[PDB]
Symmetry: C5
Subunit: 311 residues, 5 copies
């Protein structure tokens, strides 16, 4: 077996097509997602052409080893796909219709800048190295590109599974390579985040702000310090499900901002007490009365400023 000879000096076009059957295990920290899909391939091999009237049969079936099949690989994969050949059908003109069912862990980076309101574009790159005899070029057969209705990615909404029709043909190690981009657009389901993380956080922060309606230093310390323990607990819980980004994220910004609001609250609590011990509660109550309005107002404005900057 060797590649099919060219009629003129034109390159061999291979008609790709990925159809998602199962989409699962999107690891955010690892920036990986598992996929079980159908891989369709089609090319013209004139050596396999036959007369349908004399042969009697309209379509001829072949075993993978019997005929020449292009060596198609995935770029962004951890290991080589677990492929199972479904069918190889040859038309009278010599057009081969290959179909396999594969499974592979795909390495696709994620942008956590707008987390957990973020949307992602997952990539699946198909590639083919051109042989010495002739050059191989990939093509998208839009009829054979899609996903099944049941396909569910836990905690995400699957928008579209499209493919960049024009391949990126480039030189690599003195040989031509044709690369195709399969884009899977997904948007995060941010419902759960509000009653489970966002609201209980705010509640623990508001509990700290009750120290503005108290003159008891001992109780204020117990309030602001203990609520900070709850803050650390919640901060650790989030950053464990997120990778170390060289960029600032929307959550990371708020997370950091709350740490400042706790530090400044401690300073307030410390100042309030220092003045009361120094016998000037007129100054202490005026600062505390200001902080009653200041802390939520500045927090509300700073959040608007952040949400802007990020959205």
């Amino acid at each position: 077996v060797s590649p099919p000879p060219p009629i003129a000096d034109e390159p061999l076009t291979v008609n790709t097509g990925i159809y998602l059957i199962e989409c699962y295990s999107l690891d955010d920290k690892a920036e990986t997602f598992k996929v079980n899909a159908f891989l369709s391939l089609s090319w013209k091999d004139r050596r396999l052409a036959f007369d349908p009237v004399r042969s009697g049969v309209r379509v001829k079936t072949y075993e993978p080893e019997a005929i020449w099949i292009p060596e198609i690989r995935f770029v962004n994969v951890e290991n080589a796909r677990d492929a199972d050949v479904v069918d190889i059908s040859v038309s009278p003109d010599g057009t081969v219709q290959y179909l396999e069912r594969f499974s592979a862990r795909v390495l696709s980076p994620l942008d956590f800048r707008r987390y957990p309101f973020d949307s992602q574009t997952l990539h699946i790159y198909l590639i083919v190295r051109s042989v010495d005899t002739r050059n191989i070029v990939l093509a998208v057969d839009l009829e054979k590109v899609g996903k099944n209705d049941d396909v569910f990615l836990t905690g995400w909404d699957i928008e579209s599974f499209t493919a960049v029709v024009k391949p990126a043909n480039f030189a690599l190690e003195d040989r031509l390579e044709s690369k195709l981009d399969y884009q899977l657009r997904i948007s995060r389901q941010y419902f759960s985040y509000i009653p489970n993380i966002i609201l209980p956080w705010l509640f623990i922060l508001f509990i700290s702000w009750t120290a503005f309606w108290s003159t008891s230093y001992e109780a204020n310390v117990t309030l602001v310090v203990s609520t900070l323990i709850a803050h650390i607990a919640f901060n650790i819980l989030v950053e464990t499900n997120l990778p170390k980004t060289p960029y600032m994220t929307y959550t990371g910004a708020i997370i950091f901002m709350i740490y400042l609001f706790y530090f400044v609250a401690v300073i307030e609590v410390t100042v309030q007490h220092y003045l009361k011990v120094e016998s000037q509660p007129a100054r202490a109550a005026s600062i505390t009365r200001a902080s009653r309005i200041a802390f939520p107002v500045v927090f509300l404005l700073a959040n608007i400023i952040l949400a802007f900057l990020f959205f």
Copy 2:
């Protein structure tokens, strides 16, 4: 090897049948379950038919490679099943009786809306792509569908393992596909949840409500704040064993409701103290006396409201 030619122009019926040997590893967060089972297949291949009189033997055994076997796959699987062919027996009329023993991690979504008092219907989808020569249609042989008595799924009660007799025949990538549904009904064992999680929770919440029989702000802060740490501990413990649902769960609802009861308790504790410092304990004791009855009554009613909305 090629498919058996049709008498007439009727499609090939393949008689399926799954018999569960082992059912284990139900990952709730991953929405997967592992299964070790028997897969029975039966079809008529007239090319394999023989006369039992001259042959001598009533049955004829074959190696998988020797005869045509339909390419049967599972839809909702992570990877291709680890199958081991047990037996291939051919009757004189040409009826093939295939039997294999497989193991596969099955991707079946779970509805956590009524967790941990929830029940689930696990699915196992059998599929076959129809060849060019003739169309392949799946069928359920109810005699060969079941589970062994020992089959145990830790923390669950196995109700029934049935199969939707009528296959879902549809078109996919210009070829017919016959899909069968194997339903495994299971209900959660919610015993452990009461003494381990539900009761100790309530106890830590009741401990926070002892602040209604105390006028000591320092002790009340220490009461309501520290019990909130215990609440956060138990909240994190539950939501780690559950995936991020776009829908509200029965547990999630109570979990959120307790966070409110803690926030309102802090407001009470703050108000009670503010009035005492402002020299009006008549107002403070009246609010505290009301909260002694209010907090459990509202909590008891709100739980009935939630349980009614979910069950």
Copy 3:
């Protein structure tokens, strides 16, 4: 290759024998254990019989593919065993002596009712599906059943590795199956549990009971509440190493009982303070003086009651 023809109509007896080489990875939560062992098999195949005088050799060696070997499988396994054929020796009478070295993760349920003073009986089920030609029946060759002396299962004491000599012959999917039970009795090493978990727990509980020799509500709250945080820490630590049981466990019972002792201690602390504020320390000191004796006495008796009910 086909099964050996039966003299008269008797079933084929296959002489099994498992010899444990390595026993490791007992996952309590998963109810699984890994095993590396020897699997011996012996049957009479009269077609392989020879004369030792003319052949010169007393024993004839064969490759697995060359002769008929019975399809022996394990029932309670996650996946098919990783077997390596050690030796196949044939005697002049046609008696085949098969020996393989395998490794498989065995699914054996555990009874945590008496944890950590519990003992377990691990099972390894050998099975053989009877062919059309003749019925296959398993048998135990007690000479080839055992374990090596070095075999160590971390945190457990290996009592005995025996086998139920009489197989459980039953019908399944219109074919006979012969099932054998290999029992591995193990008892837990409960030393570590006393100084690491049992005693430090008791210490944190006794620390809470020092609130019976104190009239300071602020200090009593700090005592009983903070020690409850330590209790939650230790409770979480244990239930993470144990699966969700539909039955009550010995540990789970004590775990729950301590939660009650903490709740009742809070009620005492609350009552004591309420009476002191209400100006009646005669009633408060009398209740506290009673609780000094009551709490350890009731705890000691309730533990005897539990230990009696469980052992």
Copy 4:
């Protein structure tokens, strides 16, 4: 292929030799370590002997399948080694020189009695089951036993990789087996343990002992109780990296001893307060003044007693 016939009735000696290339993943809890090494084997097969003059070549290379190779296995392995045959060279006298490169997870128990100042002797057991024709006996070729200089086991110092020259020849299932011991001596790098675990622990314990220079029960409770939370945190951190030992460990002993020092400190704090409330601070200050010296002195002596008993 069959074993080489004996000249006289002597057993076949196979010259073993393990050369470590990579040594990694020492799991303390699992009592396993991974190894990537060279396995050399040498035996005399007179059937393969040739004349170097007539043949023209002084050495003959063979494919594994072409010649008889002894079935060498590892005793203490999870699964069969991932071997790759490097070279098979035959000398004119029939001496075969086999060399393979393998990788296997080795099951070697560890003695945690002196942890983290403990040293371990890791074992790699080579075995061969004697065939019918003749008995196979293993031998150490010390020239082919070693490790590469780069070989690094994270957190350990590799002392020596030696082999017990005399094999342990024994009977098993009526056949002789020759077992060889390959010992890898390693000692723990206990540096990190001092500034990371040992010193911060002591610091949190000394912080608890500041309650001996205070008469404030409320502050003393806050001191001894909160520092106990830090103790529990640090105790859990260590015992998670260590398996459940039926024997007492050096760390476990100290860990338990500190729990007692916390319990006794609480009793002191409780007694001190009881006497002050009972109006006798002369008795309370005398006990507290004694405890200032008693606690560190008894702790320092008890540690010397333990270190002696263990080292």
Copy 5:
């Protein structure tokens, strides 16, 4: 198949070349990184010479099994690489051009001394054992050494992927070995570390230092002790992502230094209170006033001293 005979008595030069396609999963604790790359190999096999006029092709293709291919292995790998042969092209002179696509988890040690401002040099060692017929020597073909632009290692900046052109030819087990070094230089992205870890637990440390503007022992204990709980939380979080180093790390040094600052702060708080109780607040306030300046100044200087010693 055997090695190609030498023209004169020169060794066989094999032209290596690694081209990284995917670089992922850098486990810091395990000191491993996964890589998906192209492995190019080129050697002259004069036996494979052909006349393109007679052959009909200028470049002849071969299956791996058909021709002699050098046994190239990786030194620092966990297991044998998952290789897939892309192309084998032979020119009329007999120059073989081998290309495979592999994936392997590479064992490369990391120096955590300057963590997280540390840079690393990852190694990939190619090796070939010389056969008895002739010696094999590796060579770098710099044209076929590189990485793709998309190659992303999460949390790291990929500097350069170079190769030490001169191989390390040495003797091992009486045979020559040619070893090549492939160096992948990477530097850590230390941005995330500042707002997520560095700043929040400078904030928790400063919160403890507010005890210098307070004379309330009860509040000071609650301050310094509770902030120490936050410190322990943050210490455990870091050392879990780092392996046990026999050397001191930059982070480990600061981590330890903060533990001292907490211990000394407790001593201050204890001394301050002892003098107040002993009726000498002039001495107590003077020490506290000094500590207000002392603690940040000493901390700032000690950090400069550490940063100088490490960088």
